[PDB]
Each structure stands twice: as C-alpha cells, then as structure tokens.
Model the fold of this input.
Amino acid sequence: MSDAGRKGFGEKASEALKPDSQKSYAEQGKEYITDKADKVAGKVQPEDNKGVFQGVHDSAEKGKDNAEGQGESLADQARDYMGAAKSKLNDAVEYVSGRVHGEEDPTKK
Done:
C-alpha cells in the first residue's frame, strides 16, 4: 500500500516478478505473428477460399491492454523487512554488548 521512489532493490524487484531471462516468450511472440499472417490472408476472398470460423474467431484478435497506476506495492514488503531488521538487530546488540562486558570473564592480561 504505497507508491514512490525506491532503492536499488526496486529495479531488481520489478525484474524478479517479471519473466526474467529469455523465457519461452521467444516462441510465443513468433507464433503470434505467424498466426496473424494466416488470418489476414485467409480473410481474403481470392479465386478460391472459404472459412466461416475465421470471421467469428477474428473477434478474438481484439486485445490492446493499456497501462494504469494501481496494483501491488513493494513499499509494503520493504517496510516489513526493514522494521524486522531493527527489532532483530536491537535484540542481538543488546545481547552482544551484555556479553562483551558482563556475561564473560574480565579478561585480565
């Protein structure tokens, strides 16, 4: 629940959720075009052709998908990790400072 500039983790975060690496998208895209060249061609009425499904199915071609300013927010996941480091750290330090000088010999050399 937030939205603002992030640290170096931001870039990586967006990369993690996304399909990193080449992914199988390589084939997905290619096949996508090949599928279009078939519809655009088949849709034509040359000296010989036919296809009633090519029309009713052409409706599926629709699909733009725009952008928007909503969804998840790493800012919420960060505040959780950060705040956890404080409580966890203060817990260790208090123990360390108490051991270095308290729960250990006087160290007389």
User: Anything to note?
Assistant: The chain has one domain: 1-109.
